[PDB]
């Protein structure tokens, strides 16, 4: 099995589409120096699944609220870019090798590390309780994460500040789903 | 015969036929099946292609179900709102016939790999997924006149934080309500009610509490506060 | 059969002159991804033959009236322009392809769908009864059609307004064909 063939399949495992098959992407011959580097590289694609399942399972039911949309629709602007990187990497495969990928994909091994662990800390939270559980990720100090999550908060907390600027200047709260912390009694 | 054909090259054959599938014209390999449109690709193709092709086709099915709403809801038996909603939903399909033209030209030069396609269509997969949800929530409950303008004021409030699917549903409502608002201009500064199809909120009859009666169905649900001062 | 050859015959089927022959324009080899778009594009010619027949057949008999002649004439100024498009399009061929025609001829598939359905709704109507059956196409709301038909009406109301301004200020009605709604008795 040539090294180039591995570079062909890995560029797919970065998405979910499987030599490399599907929790670690067990690869199945070739030399040990190749299988090890594939294993770690293939596993980055597995993360992309956990962040894709959430933005697909919750984009189905219509009882997730108004905040749970601006979150599920802010995990996509942070995925189109991950689809631009896969674009560039594929144009050069026609040269790059395994040891050359590690430096290329060393940074998106972190953004796909916070997002894939930001959707598990807030699983059953809907409404404002979700905008309060993506804010408990800002007390981190890491200048690369605290400047990423502090952007998703600026989108998730836009619907919350939409009721507030409505329930203050006009006093007409309207939320079929119970999100705002001001509950009315018929 | 893509089975007896090399790997790295047959992908350039699917991306050519795949572009035709976006247009809705029956392709060579990616064909259509008789009617929610379900496609078939091929029995003998690479596993790491079909699982990627089947991710794009949900922009073909969401187009073989919007073009069928334009070529249908423009008849005269539906009113002056299910018309404008079908015209302002036709300017978009034109802007999708160009985004497939720019790709048919950029593919000649070889610069369009299948992995490159799955990135460019990302916005055209999200817009054609809103128009394929209004064209199925307008036919679920038969809406014409006002109730097909209440829906476009609630499907525009549910997207209060998306800002990429609210700048859209605010272009449809702002365009599917001019004909309704041009008879309201005649029932406010004057007394004449044209409304050839029975869709306006107020209908006349033939001692005066029975002449003009508020119709309850055809209220846009954003004039509900002033449903009385109009009459 | 080359793709360029199809672009050569289609430029003619847009007029009525027939690989593509004559109700659909059944084409008769080539790949399926070519026949389908040709049959889709040629349906502009079948809309061109129907409108042309009505203007021609009725431009023959001299018992169609004054309003009827205006309607037939009103269908030629909306055809010279369709004769100008065929002109510019052909020059480019001397590059354009099928995936490029669809956008070029997406708008004149609508004007050739109101006119080809405006001459069937008013078949046996002569005189003013025709100027009253091309006005029942203005209650449509579609801002592109209501601003086209509301022009043919402007070129169909001129003759009706002519008599009226004669039978009001001078009282001398004259119409060998019975069009005006004021019928005299010898």
Curated annotation (Swiss-Prot), chains A, C:
Which locations, inside or outside the cell, does it occupy? Cytoplasm, Cytoskeleton, Microtubule organizing center, Centrosome
Which tissues is it found in, per the record?
Answer: Ubiquitously expressed.
This protein's superkingdom? Eukaryota
Quaternary structure note: Component of the gamma-tubulin ring complex (gTuRC) consisting of TUBGCP2, TUBGCP3, TUBGCP4, TUBGCP5 and TUBGCP6 and gamma-tubulin TUBG1 or TUBG2. TUBGCP2, TUBGCP3, TUBGCP4, TUBGCP5 and TUBGCP6 assemble in a 5:5:2:1:1 stoichiometry; each is associated with a gamma-tubulin, thereby arranging 14 gamma-tubulins in a helical manner. Gamma-tubulin at the first position is blocked by TUBGCP3 at the last position, allowing 13 protafilaments to grow into a microtubule.
Q: Which family does it belong to?
A: Belongs to the TUBGCP family.
Q: What does this protein do?
A: Component of the gamma-tubulin ring complex (gTuRC) which mediates microtubule nucleation. The gTuRC regulates the minus-end nucleation of alpha-beta tubulin heterodimers that grow into microtubule protafilaments, a critical step in centrosome duplication and spindle formation.
This protein is called Gamma-tubulin complex component 3
Residue window of the full protein shown:
245 to 452 of 907
From Swiss-Prot, chain B:
Which cysteines link up through disulfide bonds? none
> Which tissues is it found in, per the record?
Ubiquitously expressed.
Q: What is the effect of changing residue 90 to C?
A: In CDCBM15; uncertain significance
> Which cell locations does it reside in?
Cytoplasm, Cytoskeleton, Microtubule organizing center, Centrosome
Q: Which family does it belong to?
A: Belongs to the TUBGCP family.
Subunit and partners: Component of the gamma-tubulin ring complex (gTuRC) consisting of TUBGCP2, TUBGCP3, TUBGCP4, TUBGCP5 and TUBGCP6 and gamma-tubulin TUBG1 or TUBG2. TUBGCP2, TUBGCP3, TUBGCP4, TUBGCP5 and TUBGCP6 assemble in a 5:5:2:1:1 stoichiometry; each is associated with a gamma-tubulin, thereby arranging 14 gamma-tubulins in a helical manner. Gamma-tubulin at the first position is blocked by TUBGCP3 at the last position, allowing 13 protafilaments to grow into a microtubule.
Q: What role is this protein assigned?
A: Component of the gamma-tubulin ring complex (gTuRC) which mediates microtubule nucleation. The gTuRC regulates the minus-end nucleation of alpha-beta tubulin heterodimers that grow into microtubule protafilaments, a critical step in centrosome duplication and spindle formation. Plays a role in neuronal migration.
Could you say which disease the record links this protein to?
Cortical dysplasia, complex, with other brain malformations 15: An autosomal recessive disorder characterized by global developmental delay, variably impaired intellectual development, speech delay, facial dysmorphism, microcephaly, and varying degrees of cortical malformations including pachygyria, thin corpus callosum and subcortical band heterotopia. Most patients have generalized seizures.
Q: What is this protein called?
A: Gamma-tubulin complex component 2
The organism encoding this protein is: Homo sapiens
Taxonomic classification:
Eukaryota, Metazoa, Chordata, Craniata, Vertebrata
Which gene underlies this protein?
A: TUBGCP2
Which span of the parent protein is shown here?
203 to 451 of 902
């Amino acid at each position: 099995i040539t090294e180039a063939a591995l570079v062909r399949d890995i560029l797919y495992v970065f998405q979910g589409i499987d030599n490399i098959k599907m929790n670690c992407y067990k690869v199945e011959n070739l030399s040990r120096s190749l299988r090890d580097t594939a294993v770690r590289l293939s596993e980055l694609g597995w993360l992309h699944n956990k962040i894709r399942r959430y933005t697909d399972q919750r984009s189905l039911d219509r009882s997730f609220g108004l905040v749970g949309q601006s979150f599920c629709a802010a995990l996509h602007q942070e995925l189109r870019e991950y689809y631009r990187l896969l674009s560039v990497l594929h144009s050069q495969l026609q040269s790059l090798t395994l040891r050359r990928l590690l430096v290329w994909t060393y940074d998106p091994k972190i953004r796909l590390k916070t997002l894939a662990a930001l959707v598990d800390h807030c699983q059953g939270r809907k409404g404002g309780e979700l905008a309060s559980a993506v804010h408990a990720y800002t007390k981190t100090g890491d200048p690369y994460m605290r400047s990423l999550v502090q952007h998703i908060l600026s989108l998730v907390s836009h619907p919350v500040l939409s009721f507030l600027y409505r329930w203050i200047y006009d006093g007409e709260l309207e939320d079929t789903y119970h999100e705002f912390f001001v509950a009315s009694d018929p | 015969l893509p089975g007896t054909l090399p790997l790295a090259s047959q992908e350039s054959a699917v991306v050519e036929d795949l572009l035709y599938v976006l247009v809705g014209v029956d392709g060579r390999y990616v064909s259509a099946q008789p009617l929610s449109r379900t496609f078939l690709v091929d029995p003998n193709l690479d596993l790491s292609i079909r699982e990627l092709v089947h991710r794009i086709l949900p922009v073909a099915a969401s187009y073989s179900a919007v073009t069928r709403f334009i070529e249908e809801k423009s008849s005269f038996e539906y009113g002056q709102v299910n018309h404008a909603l079908a015209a302002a939903m036709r300017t978009l399909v034109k802007e999708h016939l160009i985004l497939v033209s720019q790709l048919e030209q950029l593919h000649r030069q070889g610069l369009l790999s299948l992995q490159k396609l799955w990135f460019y269509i990302q916005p055209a997969m999200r817009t054609m997924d809103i128009l394929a949800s209004l064209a199925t929530s307008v036919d679920k409950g038969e809406c014409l006149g006002g109730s097909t303008l209440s829906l476009l004021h609630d499907r525009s409030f549910s997207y209060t934080g998306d800002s990429q699917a609210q700048e859209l549903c605010l272009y449809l409502t702002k365009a599917a309500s001019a004909p309704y608002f041009e008879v309201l201009e005649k029932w406010i500064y004057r007394g004449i009610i044209h409304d050839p199809y029975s869709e306006f909120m107020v209908e006349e009859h033939e001692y005066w509490d029975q002449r003009y009666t508020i119709v309850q169905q055809q209220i846009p649900s954003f004039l509900q506060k002033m449903a009385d001062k109009i009459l």
